[PDB]
Design goal:
The structure is cut from a larger assembly and holds chains A, B, C, D, E and F. Chain B has one helix and no strands. By secondary structure, chain B is an all-alpha fold. The termini of chain E are far apart. Chain E has one domain. Chain E contains no helices and seven strands. Classes of the chains: A alpha+beta, B mainly alpha, C mainly beta, D mainly alpha, E mainly beta, F alpha+beta. Chains A and E meet through β1 of A and β1, β2, β4 and β7 of E. The complex binds magnesium ion (MG) (5 copies). The structure holds three RNA strands. The PDB classes it as ribosome.
RNA sequence: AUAGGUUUGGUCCUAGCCUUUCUAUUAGCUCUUAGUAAGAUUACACAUGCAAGCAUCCCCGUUCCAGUGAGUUCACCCUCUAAAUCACCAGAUCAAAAGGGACAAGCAUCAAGCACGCAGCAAUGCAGCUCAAAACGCUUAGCCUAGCCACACCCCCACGGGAAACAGCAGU
RNA sequence: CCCCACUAUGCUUAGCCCUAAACCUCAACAGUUAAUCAACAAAACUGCUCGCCAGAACACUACGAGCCACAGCUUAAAACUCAAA
RNA sequence: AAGUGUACUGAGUGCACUUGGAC
């Protein structure tokens, strides 16, 4: 996702999390505490990633 | 729908976090009781010797 | 170096290639000035014919005349290409046999 | 404002002693700061500032507590160099302490502003952001910058 | 919506407030080094319009592209102060936090 | 003469700062003007001089030293320095030298020509720690400031100067405000060069081609033509824009003096890198000429009747080297 | 690189240079035929011939094609929206100008640029803006090739001036 | 080179200059002893960061610049040469 | 003995430093 800006923040809050800002102004807060990296990847894929159908269409 | 599911999962993880914090707070209070006993013992000896 | 150091320093800056004796050109024209002989570095000793020639860029250089026999004389036009001689220190050019005043090798 | 503790002030270890005020005035004098060295004065100043500012003066490893202690040390070094103006070692220590206090102030500002403001007000420390560039101010640069400033003012 | 500016939404850090109602925000994008293939924080400077002058140096801000550039450089408006400097509220638990330690415990209410 | 009969009396009652325009190179008359006192030479407008070769500053200091020797004890001159009031180059070192030694005690009289930059140097020194803001006192009312008092004397006007003929705008254009960029041109015999409408050169009777490097204001057009067309172009384009100096068209040209001629013979050509002579058109600028080895050239410089044309030893003998390459058939070299 | 030779009395290591491979230009010597591809070194000057007509007059075209690489982050994406085609309109297509983003190399012995910003309807105020994460500046180069950018003798432009223009083909 | 006497200087104050085989010739921090390893030297390594080098000589040099306040230091090249060092 | 830095003198000496020397 070359155009999706990505920024990091070390030790800003007691708990870790992700937050995505969408073009529509919506903000999606994802809790990652206690989750493995694979689990986090799968969760973000489910909630915001294009499906294989869309990828094949492209 | 996906956003609603995300918020539901956030709520679930929040409940788990609250439970963890409750248990950790119980343990911390129990251990800090002994820590405070140690501190009181040290202080009492200090004040006694100084007096 | 570290990855950050490599990133900061970027790719290697290959130095520009120094211009050869012929200033990067495979050949040049020139006017002979003075012919003479030279002694090659030992163990090689056989006398070698050289000539001072003023290139098309004004620069004057000593150029080895290969082969046996010639007619090169003062103010005569020659063509000189690159190529240092094995045992003539300083001499870094060669008259191309078979061009202009350089009548073919006088065999 | 950095007035020193009154000499009569008893040491920290004895300010908590019961009946301390109900003993001989000579004993009080002996236990006072007057009959003690500068380390005791610095400790009393640290106690004063801690009680004044930090929410929990009982915590000594807090970032605020560290900043207070380091500020006390910096004051000590400043007073020391007011006399030993030629002490290069303590000059270095003062400069290092100032740098460390600036770093700790930055950390506190980034973490807990609500308390960073209280630290700054309590210790009279006007925090200043670091200069963007350290380029040496040599004669030519200074003169040309002054000339350019005057030129801009004239144009204005 | 149909904004003429390039980057619709960008999260950056306020690094200057010496301009009336305008905050100098620094935005950092991970950039792939074509050779090392490691990602580095390339950074660019943006100016965010702040009518309320609520920006403080060090704040983390979200900037929304203006419909049109309102000045030679002001191309975004401060949509929301994401992290007020040293006054961070954990978005997860909503309670104030100081670094990695809660001020008000989440069990408070 | 006015300076001799009004100001010299006061001066001959201490230190003198004699300012000399480096580009324009009153010196021999100093013994009567100031008298036998300590004098320091300040070569002004050095920044505008191109760096022809390394050590050109040292060469200029030397040249000033021989000029003073030609004219004076080394009146005694105790220091020769190069300064640029515009860029503040060397002003602080001059101040340090002034304050460092016993010999510099008393008042300071700043003597020089009109264009030397006395005003700029006085303002620079006033805006410095050297002064203890400025006052005006009759000597003629002149400026001064305490240091003992600094004295800024009236500038000595220069006779036979093209600036006198030129108007305010023309003088502003002619005077270089930025560092000068030499402009070289390879010329064959029987050709003509035009530095504005003020200066012209006709090169002829030359056994070989030569190079002419114009050192003048970057905004002064330089035009090359044949001898035949040189005149006709001159009348057609006098003033206007092709020759931007003077301005006003035929109206201004009617009052402008016609260009009188002056013949020149150049010495043996000292190679193709060392200038043989600088032909100076008063304060407008000069042209350094490099003939070929052993070559002797004939020249005719046309300069306004009132002003004068001066052939001098090259001020920047190695200025021909700084250049680029010939552009098209045009004689011009690409400027570096 | 599958490497090889070369420093020493000898060995090992480090390190450069050269050989081997494939291209292109030029040159020497040499050479039979056929098809195809490609073709000034020169942004130096040009003799000569030609390269823009069509058409019931008005119009339209000669702004294209063709050429060169001097200069050079004017090329790509997004926004908006001119001109043009769709016998008219349509929105469609094409793509200018303008705004945002992106975008070569070396030099730091080019370290500061010197107004390079902002608010305000305006007065006017604020005093800022870029830069060691390379600003500013000097030097070199056409590029990211179905093609693209730029130039059209020069004065960046071209009213005007310089002067009489092949970087259109053939040719000198 | 040896003997004699003596001066800068070694010393105090107040300012400057900023270079040493300024060397443990072994950068900071964390970690390990698992399988040793050009040679010698202070056993061998891992992670992490900053600085530095890209053959020799030209060259602790020239030019420019900074510090100077003019006889010096820092920064630091190029050309030419060689197949070595 | 060798060398680094520094200064005088015309290769040595003076001061400090290192062993990249011996006991
Ligand atoms: Mg052939
Ligand atoms: Mg044009
Ligand atoms: Mg042409
Ligand atoms: Mg042709
Ligand atoms: Mg003595």
């Amino acid at each position: 996702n070359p155009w999706v800006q990505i920024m990091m923040f070390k030790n800003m809050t007691p708990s870790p999390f992700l937050r995505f800002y969408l073009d529509s102004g919506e903000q999606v807060l994802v809790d990652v505490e206690t989750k493995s990296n694979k689990e986090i990847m799968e969760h973000i894929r489910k909630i915001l990633g294009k499906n294989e159908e869309t990828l094949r269409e492209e | 729908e996906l956003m609603a599911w995300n918020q539901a999962e956030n709520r679930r993880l929040h409940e788990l976090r609250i439970a963890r914090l409750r248990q950790e707070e119980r343990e911390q209070e129990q251990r800090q009781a002994l820590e405070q006993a140690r501190k009181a013992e040290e202080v009492q000896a200090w004040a006694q010797r100084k007096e | 170096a570290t990855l950050n150091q490599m990133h900061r320093l970027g790719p290697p800056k290959r130095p520009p290639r120094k211009l050869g004796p012929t200033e990067g050109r495979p050949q040049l024209k020139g006017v002979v000035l003075c012919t003479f002989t030279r002694k090659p570095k030992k163990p090689n000793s056989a006398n070698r014919k050289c000539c001072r020639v003023r290139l098309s860029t004004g620069r004057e250089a000593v150029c080895f005349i290969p082969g046996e026999g010639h007619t090169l004389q003062e103010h005569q036009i020659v063509l000189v290409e690159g190529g240092r001689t094995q045992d003539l220190p300083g001499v870094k050019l060669t008259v191309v046999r078979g061009k202009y005043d350089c009548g073919h090798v006088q065999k | 404002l950095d007035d020193d503790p009154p000499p009569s002030t008893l040491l920290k270890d004895y300010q908590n002693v019961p009946g301390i005020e109900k003993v001989d005035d000579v004993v009080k004098r002996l236990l006072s700061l007057e009959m003690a060295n500068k380390k005791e004065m610095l400790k009393i100043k640290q106690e004063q500032f801690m009680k004044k500012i930090v929410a929990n003066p009982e915590d000594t490893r807090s970032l605020e507590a560290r900043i207070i202690a380091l500020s006390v040390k910096i004051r000590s070094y400043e007073e020391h160099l007011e006399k030993h103006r030629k002490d290069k070692a303590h000059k270095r220590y003062l400069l290092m302490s100032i740098d460390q206090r600036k770093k700790m102030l930055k950390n506190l500002r980034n973490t807990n502003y609500d308390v960073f403001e209280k630290i700054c007000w309590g210790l009279g420390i006007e925090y200043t952001f670091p200069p963007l560039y350290y380029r040496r101010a040599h004669r030519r640069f200074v003169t040309k910058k002054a000339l350019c400033i005057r030129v801009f003012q004239e144009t204005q | 919506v149909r904004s003429s500016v390039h980057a619709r939404w960008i999260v950056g850090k306020v690094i200057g407030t010496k301009m009336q109602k305008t905050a100098k925000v620094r935005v950092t994008r991970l950039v792939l080094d074509p050779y090392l293939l490691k990602y580095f924080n390339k950074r660019k400077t943006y100016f965010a319009h702040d009518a309320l002058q609520q920006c403080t140096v060090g704040d983390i801000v979200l900037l929304r592209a203006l419909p049109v550039p309102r000045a030679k450089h002001v191309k975004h408006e401060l949509a929301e102060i994401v992290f007020k400097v040293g006054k961070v509220i954990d978005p997860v638990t909503g309670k104030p936090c100081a670094g990695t330690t809660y001020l008000e415990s989440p069990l408070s209410s | 003469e006015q300076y001799l009969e009004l100001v010299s009396a006061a001066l001959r009652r201490s230190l003198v700062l004699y300012m000399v325009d480096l580009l324009d190179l009153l010196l021999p008359d100093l013994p009567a003007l100031v008298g036998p006192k300590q004098l320091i030479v300040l070569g002004n407008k050095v920044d505008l001089l191109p760096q022809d070769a390394p050590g050109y500053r040292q060469r200029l200091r030397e040249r000033l030293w021989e000029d003073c020797a030609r004219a004076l004890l080394l009146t005694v001159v105790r220091d020769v320095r190069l300064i640029s009031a515009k860029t503040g180059y060397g002003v602080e070192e001059l101040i340090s030298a002034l304050q460092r030694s016993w010999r510099y005690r008393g008042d300071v009289y700043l003597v020089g020509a009109t264009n030397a930059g006395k005003s700029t140097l006085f303002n620079t020194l006033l805006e410095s720690d050297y002064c203890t803001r400025a006052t005006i006192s009759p000597w003629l009312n002149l400026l001064k400031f305490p240091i003992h008092w600094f004295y800024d004397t009236p500038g000595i006007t220069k006779e036979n100067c093209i600036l006198n003929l030129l108007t305010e705008k023309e003088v502003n254009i002619v005077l270089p405000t930025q560092s000068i960029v030499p402009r070289t041109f390879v010329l064959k015999p029987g050709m003509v060069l035009f530095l504005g409408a003020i200066g012209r050169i006709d090169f002829l009777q030359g056994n070989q081609s030569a190079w002419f490097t114009v050192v003048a204001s970057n905004i002064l057009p330089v035009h090359i033509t044949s001898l035949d067309r040189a005149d006709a172009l001159y009348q057609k384009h006098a003033g206007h824009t092709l020759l931007q100096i003077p301005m006003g068209g035929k109206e201004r040209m009617a009052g402008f003096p016609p260009l009188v001629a002056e013949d020149i013979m150049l010495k043996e050509g000292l190679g193709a890198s060392e200038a043989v002579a600088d032909i100076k058109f008063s304060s407008a600028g000069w042209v350094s000429v490099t003939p070929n080895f052993k070559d002797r050239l004939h020249l005719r410089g046309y300069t306004p009747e009132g002003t004068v044309l001066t052939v001098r030893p090259p001020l920047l003998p190695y200025i021909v080297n700084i250049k680029g390459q010939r552009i098209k058939k045009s004689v011009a070299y690409k400027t570096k």
